[PDB]
Paper text:
To investigate the structural basis for the unusual specificity displayed by B035DRAFT_03340GH92 we determined the crystal structure of the enzyme to 1.43 Å. The GH92 consists of two domains: an N-terminal β-sandwich domain composed of 16 antiparallel β-strands domain and an (α/α)6-barrel catalytic domain. These two domains are pinned together by two α-helices, previously dubbed helix 1 and 2. The density for several metal ions was observed bound to the protein surface, which were modeled as Na from the crystallization conditions, except for a Ca near the active site, as this metal has been shown to be key for GH92 activity. The +1 mannose is likely recognized by the side chains of at least three residues: H530, S533, and E532, which are positioned underneath the mannose. Overhanging this subsite (and possibly the +2 GlcNAc position also) are three hydrophobic residues Y72, W178, and W209, which is suggestive of π-stacking of the sugars. There are clear pockets for these sugars in the B035DRAFT_03340GH92 structure. The lack of activity seen for BT3991GH92 is likely due to the plant-specific β1,2-xylose on the core mannose causing steric hindrance within the active site, whereas B035DRAFT_03340GH92 is able to accommodate this decoration.
We describe the biochemical characterization of five CAZymes and two crystal structures to provide a degradation pathway for plant complex N-glycans encoded by the human gut microbiome. In this study we characterize the likely pathway for the degradation of plant N-glycans by a prominent member of the human gut microbiota.
Residue numbers in the entry: 30 to 86, 86A, 86B, 87 to 529, 532 to 731
């Protein structure tokens, strides 16, 4: 079966989603995709489905980020007049003739009257342009272009740019830009026809990039092929990358390689359901596998955070580690379904820690962006170790964890303050005091877990003490995780609904209603703080029913104050089950499936967040979720499709059956594992990997 047919790459091409529709390989360096715009300047995302103007095609993209992006090397077919203003090469296009499938994108560009087709290898983009008009057939190569939230930034974003025509078919160059991350890239670009003339357009005073119009001698209907390979290291690295992957001009072959690569992953799960269910699921699977992105050359060389070219220990170095999001479910998903990449990811995290002094917080292009809170590379490593991954040096990995959690670092990890108080005090830490505290607690728990498993008794005791610090922020009077002053008192006034954006506030992208539940490692301890299951459940009921009338304009993703697009919320629906009311978890997961994920461009409730929203969906569809990722226990909610078969790495299969699932039959009567009654509220990683059959008998009665 061809599972790629269920991937709709336009899903999430919207303000809520921030996906890209163009061609990439799983975990690749190239995401070659259209840049679109409308009227005025859009803050974020290079493509949205409602736009009807294409600026060109860039070679690098992040999937589902809030605003960070790469968007390097804009190319655009041009016909007619060669010299124009920088913004005058754009084109309308029809939706009818735009199409995509994993590894491939095509669109008809009305203005130049050119069809564009894009495919990709791990390090190269390959384009095929058909010039219906071949009048001064040309290509714009725009090295100034990049994704910025305003136009002033756009015209100043390049710090350095050098290009060279090596011959009539080959352009090479180097760009450094600054916006979201300090990025150096090098490229080799080749055309399959000789360039007959080239022109540099005049650049703005602050523009350090270049805009090149390259021309070709062509006739109507003729094709031009362009390939471009990138490198972090140098032009020779880019050349070697190209030679390894696109040595000639085999467009159909590259497209097929990409198709087959995607199917080699997607075929690891067989979903039975409606067409829409399969489209939702396989598109999620696709989104989860776009990143982390390989950025090393084919020989393992990469440019690291010290701006030095070095060799990856494993031969491959990855970045794009959106760890605040992904530690929660995307990383667990890789441990199950993409285990052969986990050791490589851990090695990449550790190597960068050894350069910068702490694990990547939000790693991009091998650099640090410091985005969001916590240090959740710690969870990823501890989880991998707990689950039996041994393709990394555990001593080096634990040293990275220990340095991360005990040596203070930017932007938020002031451990002297933290250990003085047992929390980050709101009066001393201007923003995110509570979110940074509670999220750091999880990392200390993870550190303790790995320490215990390595027999590091003293370290385990140290980190276990820190893992209890969540208790220091729970106000029993109001029953919220509440900001706390350095003098011990609670912050007043206190509005538990007030959303924080570091406008400021003590939480991250949310409020106390969400963060009160952020104790993934010790849900029993949190229940105890509440005074038992009954008051805990009463407070959850309030979370899911509280709507605000004077604020909170877009309620996108919200069920009361539960915010499905905000990652702190992702484990919350499962807390009902963990407090002895699983039928409510079952109802709520179904509600999320009914409302928050549809197989349409505008069908997502929120940005995909580098595969985290997608991994949430895939786990929840199977009926279990990693509330506590390091534990390797998956807490039951309810399956959402009739049957899901996992093909595991050793040839075993784990089959999930939602026996009798329907619109109203959404509750679980009973669970059997390998034919025997199963009464625990979770299933272990080990039990999944053993293979077999998990049958949820579905019912109406509740
Ligand atoms: Ca989010
Ligand atoms: K923009
Ligand atoms: K860039
Ligand atoms: K279409
Ligand atoms: Na425009
Ligand atoms: Na089109
Ligand atoms: Na011509
Ligand atoms: Na950049
Ligand atoms: Na021509
Ligand atoms: Na590189
Ligand atoms: Na994790
Ligand atoms: Na989690
Ligand atoms: Na992982
Ligand atoms: Na890395
Ligand atoms: Na990184
Ligand atoms: Na992990
Ligand atoms: Na979660």
């Amino acid at each position: 079966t061809d599972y790629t047919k269920y991937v709709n790459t336009f899903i999430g091409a919207a303000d809520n989603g921030h996906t890209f529709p163009g061609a990439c390989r799983p975990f690749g360096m190239i995401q070659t995709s259209p840049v679109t715009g409308a009227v005025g300047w859009r803050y974020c995302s290079e493509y949205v489905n409602s736009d009807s103007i294409i600026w060109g095609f860039t070679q690098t993209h992040l999937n589902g980020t809030g605003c960070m992006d790469l968007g390097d090397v804009l190319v655009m077919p041009v016909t007619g007049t060669r010299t124009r203003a920088w913004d005058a090469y754009r084109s309308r296009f029809s939706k009818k003739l735009e199409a995509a499938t994993p590894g491939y994108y095509t669109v008809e560009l009305t203005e130049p009257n050119v069809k564009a087709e894009l495919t990709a290898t791990p390090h190269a983009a390959l384009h095929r342009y058909t010039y219906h008009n071949a009048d001064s057939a040309s290509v714009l190569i725009d090295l100034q272009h990049g994704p910025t939230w305003n136009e002033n930034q756009y015209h100043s974003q390049v710090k350095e740019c050098e290009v060279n025509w090596e011959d009539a078919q080959t352009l090479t160059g180097h760009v450094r830009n600054s916006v979201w991350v300090n990025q150096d890239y090098f490229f080799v670009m080749k055309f399959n026809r000789p360039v007959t003339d080239s022109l540099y357009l005049p650049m703005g005073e602050t523009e350090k990039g270049k805009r090149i119009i390259a021309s070709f001698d062509m006739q109507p209907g003729e094709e031009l092929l362009m390939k471009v390979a990138l490198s972090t290291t140098g032009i020779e690295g880019a050349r070697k990358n190209m030679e390894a992957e696109v040595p000639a001009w085999d467009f159909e072959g590259v497209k097929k390689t990409a198709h087959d690569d995607w199917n080699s992953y997607l075929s690891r799960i067989d979903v039975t359901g409606t067409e829409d269910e399969k489209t939702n699921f396989y598109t999620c699977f696709y989104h989860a596998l776009i990143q982390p992105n390989q950025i090393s050359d084919v020989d393992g060389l990469y440019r690291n955070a010290a701006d030095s070219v070095v060799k990856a220990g494993t031969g491959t170095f990855y970045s794009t580690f959106s760890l605040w999001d992904t530690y929660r479910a995307a990383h667990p998903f890789y441990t199950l379904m993409v285990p052969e990449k986990v050791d490589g990811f851990v090695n990449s995290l550790v190597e960068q820690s050894e350069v910068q002094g702490f694990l990547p917080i939000w790693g991009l292009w091998g650099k640090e962006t410091y985005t969001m809170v916590g240090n959740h590379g710690v969870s990823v490593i501890a989880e991998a170790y707990r689950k039996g991954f041994r393709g990394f040096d555990a001593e080096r990995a634990f040293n990275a964890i220990k340095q991360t959690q005990t040596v203070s670092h930017k932007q938020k990890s002031d451990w002297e303050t933290y250990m003085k108080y047992g929390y980050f005090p709101t009066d001393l830490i201007k923003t995110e005091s509570v979110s940074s505290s509670l999220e750091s607690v999880y990392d200390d728990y993870a550190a303790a877990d790995m320490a215990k498993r390595m027999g590091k008794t003293e370290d385990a005791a140290y980190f276990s003490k820190r893992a209890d610090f969540y208790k220091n922020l729970f106000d029993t009077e109001t029953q919220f995780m509440r900001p706390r002053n350095s003098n011990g008192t609670w912050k007043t006034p206190f509005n538990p609904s007030q959303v924080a954006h570091a406008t400021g506030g003590d939480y991250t992208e949310g409020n106390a209603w969400q963060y009160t539940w952020h104790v993934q490692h010790d849900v029993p301890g949190l229940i105890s703080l509440f005074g038992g299951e009954e008051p805990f459940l009463n407070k959850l009921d309030s979370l899911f029913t509280l709507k605000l009338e004077t604020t909170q304009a877009d309620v996108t993703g919200l069920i009361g104050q539960y915010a499905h697009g905000n990652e702190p919320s992702h484990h919350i629906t499962y807390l009902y089950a963990l407090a002895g009311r699983p039928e409510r978890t079952q109802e709520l997961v179904r509600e999320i499936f009914d409302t928050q994920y549809h197989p349409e461009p505008d069908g997502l409730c929120g940005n995909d967040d580098c595969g985290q929203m997608s991994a949430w969906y895939m786990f929840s569809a199977m009926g279990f979720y990693p509330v506590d990722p390091v534990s390797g226990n998956y807490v039951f909610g309810a399956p959402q499709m009739p049957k899901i078969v996992l093909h595991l790495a050793d040839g075993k299969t784990f089959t999930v059956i939602a026996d009798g699932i329907s619109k109203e039959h959404k509750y679980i009567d009973s669970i059997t594992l390998n034919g025997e009654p199963y009464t625990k509220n979770y299933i272990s990683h080990e039990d999944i990997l053993k293979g077999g059959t998990l049958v949820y008998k579905m019912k109406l009665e509740h």
